[PDB]
Symmetry: D3
Subunit: 252 residues, 6 copies
């Protein structure tokens, strides 16, 4: 890869946006590389969790400023979005700096989001005369109503700080800048110390549950619970738990 | 009861989880006792509001680690959940310590939630190899997306503090530990100084409203408003005000 | 066409509506409601107006409310002072200058940018007088977390939420020194209006219409607004001004 | 023992018969209390797998005859004779023997199999006496196409839908010779009860809980009921009987 | 006077007649403007309780004028591009304002009903047709998507019937008989008696209590937007509003006094 | 070459024929794998605009026959059996039901765009008769048949069969065809659809199907996205021009 790095260490794959001189702006080539990296992580059985991070002053500064023959063209373009609707493995994003426009997709569609004290969040589209549809409908599911709308309306003229992002729960943790990647990998290791199919099933329970009312969400979640109950790991876990022991999960 | 305490003082019933030697873990017996206490509160006309709290260092540490002949077997098991879908009286939870797994059900389905400075919140199910379906679909309606998911994925290896819970609005107030029950009863008294059928009607407007889109939610809420408008208390309220005296609510 | 209970003023591309019954702490009367709706309609239909600011005179922003079934509006929840956010495209900013309760919360829960004075407080007194707050609190429930909304409902007039707590939960986006509230509101208005107004409108619609469907559908739905804006002259001017390192000159076409 | 209805159990079928033919089976408060006690009895008698509801005479049910907020039900729409389809898993079949109007329609719109006599007619008279039939007609609107449901609402007592038209639109599944109605209802009941009762119940729940959400979610949701039924002894017996070319013996376990 | 439609009031019934038979009642921008003024007039005249809509000639309505399809994709309004809220949503063409009007509307389909003509069939309260009427949508045959029209049809016709209509375009026409069979219409009428039967139905609806009629229509239509259980609770709001009317007291009072009610629409 | 089905392309129509008449076209795991390959092939061949599915013999499809766990995403949801991938494929599908259609066979009836049937076709689901819940199949039936008709089909199991005539009456199917002319009529309908503008056909199908997942008002606005996408096509300029010039359009599927 020329625009990113892809590395595997144990059960964690790490994708690093690696075009710091262009402030990690997404080109078509970068987008193609990201999708190959995502596919690789989804299909490598050794990989249980994906970490996404950037290099330099920007995490991702957005997109660089035959027709209808494929299904995807009928929906919103996805740009760098990880394939959260079709991949069960959890994703953690570690925001190292400026995060704007299509950069927000990682913040709004991955499972754990942490940031450097230096990170900032915004969307500049209205400042160049365009509507940022996908990005901001996603932001609207994380930030309260008038905060999401303020971000949308202010365009490039305002930036949300890491501290404010943490306050509202747009991120779960602020990390000293030089320790960002280390902490990301620590959290990853902790999540991977849990039973991976239970983790995947729980994530699905939550995310599919968000699409329906609570009562239905509970009944729906029983499907994933029942699927996980049949796993070998679900038979091993409860004995391990009462013995305060870390089992060697088999992901089966 | 041998696993809980149930006490009524004026218009407030207080249920206290009272198995500190199992850190208020829910056994089947405790669950049966809780449901009898809930039913008692719901059916005693003197009781307007239920307070739930625990004893010791745990509020509730979760569940202890003929077929299809009853309707409840077709749905998710409810464990200690108060019957918020079928009871109109408000419930306040005062979290005195560790609150995890099934303990979160009080945090996510009761109307006012406060906590001791010593309270912590988490769910250990993925650490045991299991999916906590019901519990975490509920948590996902209170915490922002990636905060709910982080709690789900971290399992027993991380605990949310009372301070962070307050910051995100998972709880509304932090109380000095030794004053928790006192403050819960003070809040209870304040709620009960308002018109109880208006309180119940307003709670229903909000909760039933959450299940449908906003515009329909507004119209739906009119039903409860109209029902309350017919009450004697809706006449007493403005009458007490014009006579510069405290209203004397009769809950009719 | 001259208002007794409010003020309506246009300066450049910003209309400012000021609730102006300070002796009644800006309580909404039926006459005030009629005047507000005329002012909203005027702002929505005047092409010069790109953005509406709403604020209050005095120390209360709004202290709430004070032939049968012959008109359609009577069949739905009464709307009181609510701006018609479901049938307008221009953004609205609310600057909460003081007490905000009952129907006052409608501006907080249905406008696009909400800021407040350090002196603002938020509550709903309905249950304290024996009545249900429907519309108001269902709306609050879409902004505040579940048990915070319910606490506000259940406490009635016996508790206030501070501006600081509001800010913490994202009920408001900013707290302003009291004497500078209006100045800051107009500053934010100017900044929004320095962006491309049809893009602002389209983005607001993407968000608001998107909240009524699941995320995936919200994304596809938003494409409609994006496609409409792509046809505008401003959509060509914007990237052009950017590549030429110069300010865009928006025509709102 | 009941004075407005009959309740009889024969094998696995309970039959509730509306039995006030001189008042055209109008629902009184006393009849409503009796119905609910019958429903509760049916739901709690393990021998009963299925409930049949029918009437006597020229009316199936001609509607309702022309402390406050202390119980939860008073916060919702009154239910009148509606069987408890949201809280009871056993299937219910309605056999409409004649006039079915107002609250009578509840059995048509909330039970699982609906058949009728060639003589049956369907309507709602509420607008003809100045009232809104809320519950009844929101339910009708889930069974008849949009403008058919609205026409029934708007015409009031002045028009009656025939059994033939009802069948054509799928408001009912079968028209029966009048004197054979009860025989055929019981035959259908026997056929349903010849299938595995927990599978029947699980399938009904899949469908009815599924209707509340989009199809994709309805499919995933249905897996819960399928998994629950897979763990029954009957789910083992069924395919075992089939492979042994033998009739299954259901234990409802 | 209108030049593309007729608008007439008799007693409690307003009748709008699409009146461009030479153009097969194709909707032009001018016709659409006239329709909207007629709708507003009907909704605001307290004497009018019910609106009947029908057409003239071999077509009820043959759709939006293809002649007027914008070269550049911008739907033309009275005002500049995106300056008004309605431009951000699907164009409504001739659709009566069913979301913001409480008075019931009956459509009597006299002939060809296609494209935007289907909006009356899918968004009015009572729909009847001449034995000659046919129903279809030709959009895919001219390279365009019927969005609004067919999402509306999909709420009335079963899944694969709606999709067949979408996919067949102008090459297939649903008969009145089939429309009746599926409940797209409630009645087929001999052609020469169509208007007469429409007014008979109208008179019957108007013999009921008009606020109860309006409240019941709202219960149903707002109820379609949420699950059944919530629909039931929601419908109580309309029921409660109507219970406060004099007519709601008059109805049962007349019945107990064994006499006919007299509605005041209050 | 496929053993359990036939896949054939003629002009813009692909035809898949379920071809296990000795098992009454019961779905085996091998048949399911072959079907999915055929669906993928049809979706990815630009010459194919429309897919016809039919069966051979007395049965269209008599239902199902009697990879590490959770390692693939499909295992997290309901098994799909023979269902065409209607959520991820834009090309329309027409099903021509030639006989018995039960259990998993109903998936074609409930999730394809045009459904026709032989006068001999019948429809039912036997699962409750063998002690099982047919979840996916019947939640889908419940979106097409009225409430108590769907429930009757679910509860009656194998003991009742809906006729083609009743299925037509309720709109479960759109046409009954003389048995020996079924395939011919299917191909005729296919040709007629393919005489329309294909990207308009696909965009309209999406408007309807994605619209069914949300309330009507949102559905109208959502449909504008597809309408706007199609407006940019060459075919969207050719169509109205051909119409006003009273001449046949020449579609390029662009």
């Amino acid at each position: 890869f020329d625009t990113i790095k892809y590395e595997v260490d144990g059960h964690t794959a790490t994708i690093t946006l690696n075009r710091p001189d262009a402030l990690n702006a997404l080109s078509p080539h970068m987008i193609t590389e990201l999708r190959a990296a995502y596919h690789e992580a989804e299909n490598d059985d050794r990989v249980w969790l994906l970490v996404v991070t950037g290099t330099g002053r920007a995490f991702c500064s957005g997109a660089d400023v035959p027709y209808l023959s494929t299904y995807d063209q009928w929906e919103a373009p996805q740009e760098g979005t990880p394939p959260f609707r079709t991949m069960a493995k959890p994703v953690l994003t570690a925001v190292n700096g400026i995060c704007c426009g299509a950069g927000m997709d990682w913040v709004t569609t991955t499972d754990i989001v942490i940031a450097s004290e230096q990170a900032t969040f915004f969307d500049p589209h209205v400042s160049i005369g365009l509507v940022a549809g996908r990005e901001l409908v996603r932001v609207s599911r994380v930030l309260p109503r008038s905060i999401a709308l303020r971000m949308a309306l202010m365009g490039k003229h305002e930036r949300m700080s890491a501290q404010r992002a943490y306050e509202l729960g747009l991120i779960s943790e602020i990390v000293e800048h030089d320790r960002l990647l280390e902490r990301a990998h620590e959290i990853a290791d902790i999540v991977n110390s849990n039973a991976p199919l239970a983790v995947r099933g729980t994530r699905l329970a939550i995310l599919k549950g968000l699409n329906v009312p609570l009562h239905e969400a509970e009944i729906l979640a029983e499907t994933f619970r029942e699927r996980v109950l049949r796993t070998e790991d679900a038979a091993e876990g409860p004995r391990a738990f009462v013995e305060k022991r870390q089992p060697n999960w088999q992901c089966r």
